Amino acid sequence: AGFQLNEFSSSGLGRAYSGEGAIADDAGNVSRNPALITMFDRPTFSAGAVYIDPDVNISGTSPSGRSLKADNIAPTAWVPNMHFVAPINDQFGWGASITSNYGLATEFNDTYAGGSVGGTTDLETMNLNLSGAYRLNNAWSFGLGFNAVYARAKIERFAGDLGQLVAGQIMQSPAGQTQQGQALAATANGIDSNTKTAHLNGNQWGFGWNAEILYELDKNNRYALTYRSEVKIDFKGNYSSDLNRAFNLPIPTATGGATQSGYLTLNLPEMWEVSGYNRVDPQWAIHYSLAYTSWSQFQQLKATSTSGDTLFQKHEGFKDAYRIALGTTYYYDDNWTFRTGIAFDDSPVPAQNRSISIPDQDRFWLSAGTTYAFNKDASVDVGVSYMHGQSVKINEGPYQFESEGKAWLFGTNFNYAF
Ligand SMILES: CCCCCCCCCCCC[N+](C)(C)[O-]
């Protein structure tokens, strides 16, 4: 998953988010799978957070001989979640929740030789969801939900050695000797590492909806199909570039540092997910899922000026991708519950499109969790998950890098009910 997040509950973390639309042992699940609402016969609560500790690294050498060693470019994060589910009557119930389905944060040193293709990239996302559900009969249930997505993002790029590279090019071609071509490679080579090559930031809201059909063969077996609509966010922020208005080459529009309104449309992929849950035995349940995310909808990142011109652009060309997950839950005794999960979700970025801003790659999830219930009305969820990613090669601009990533997740949630 590119800039997607799966941390909506601590229970799901311990089970590697496998079959999340077919399980409902705690309120956290109905946040992304509405129909599960008809699985609760009483007001239920849950709140907590997942701490993410990534270890992402970039390596390589610039044509300028300088090092492209970006060490630990992914900051640690806390992704909170909060859930409420309540029955209206015997046929209807609803739910509310706050979670985060998208996010990203990559930051290099502004003196990094790769400044032009990697400086600072941040995307914070908050999703407010109000849902409702209807239970046709003992087998079928229907869930509808509306979402309010808030997103704050900030992109800033610099110039690593581009000045030295272009200046070195201007001094290798015939136009080198020219007292004009040299006063050109003296200016180019002049630009410092930390020279804000671009700056975009802004906040905005997007809206979307959910639909799920839950089918249960019985009290111990059910399967489900859920639709998560795409969400477009039309930002309206601030753009600028410290490069002299003169420089206006495949460079972002220079504004001599001045700021001007900027417009950008972020496309958050829609999602389809089929899942099942099998309570094979009084104490064991098996849960699995396949998720299809159409990252195709995220074709680019283009910034427009009020006038309509392009101030900043970056091709992304993402392809739809799948996430596969298998896990099991051990309902030990009235007090203890244990869970494991393994999962694999392949990155939607084609090798040809990879960039150091989203050091993304195929991922392996291995996870474990436990749940202590204090009395059937209160419980705590503790989950842990290990993430390791495929190491890949990146060709961006004149540079060539190589990145690898691994991450650890710890999460805690407290549950309550009446
Ligand atoms: C006018 C400002 C518009 C805000 C620009 C915010 C873009 C957030 C996109 C995050 C995706 C990260 N990526 C593609 C750059 O690696």
Curated annotation (Swiss-Prot):
GO molecular function: ligand-gated channel activity; long-chain fatty acid transporting porin activity
Cellular compartments per GO CC: cell outer membrane
Superkingdom of the source species: Bacteria
InterPro entries registered for this protein in UniProt: OMPP1/FadL/TodX
SUPFAM superfamilies: Porins
Biological process, per Gene Ontology: long-chain fatty acid transport
Keywords: Cell outer membrane, Lipid transport, Membrane, Signal, Transmembrane, Transmembrane beta strand, Transport
Chief localisation class: membrane
Paired cysteines (S-S): none
Induction remarks: By long-chain fatty acids. Expression of fadL is under the control of the FadR repressor.
Database matches in Gene3D superfamilies: Outer membrane protein transport protein (OMPP1/FadL/TodX)
Subcellular location, record wording: Cell outer membrane
Membrane topology: Multi-pass membrane protein
Keyword Plastid: no
One Pfam family hit: Toluene_X
PANTHER family xrefs: LONG-CHAIN FATTY ACID TRANSPORT PROTEIN, OUTER MEMBRANE PROTEIN NMB0088-RELATED
Subunit structure: Has been isolated from outer membrane preparation as a homodimer.
Protein family per UniProt: Belongs to the OmpP1/FadL family.
Purpose of the protein: Involved in translocation of long-chain fatty acids across the outer membrane. It is a receptor for the bacteriophage T2. FadL may form a specific channel.
Protein name listed in UniProt: Long-chain fatty acid transport protein
Organism: Escherichia coli (strain K12)
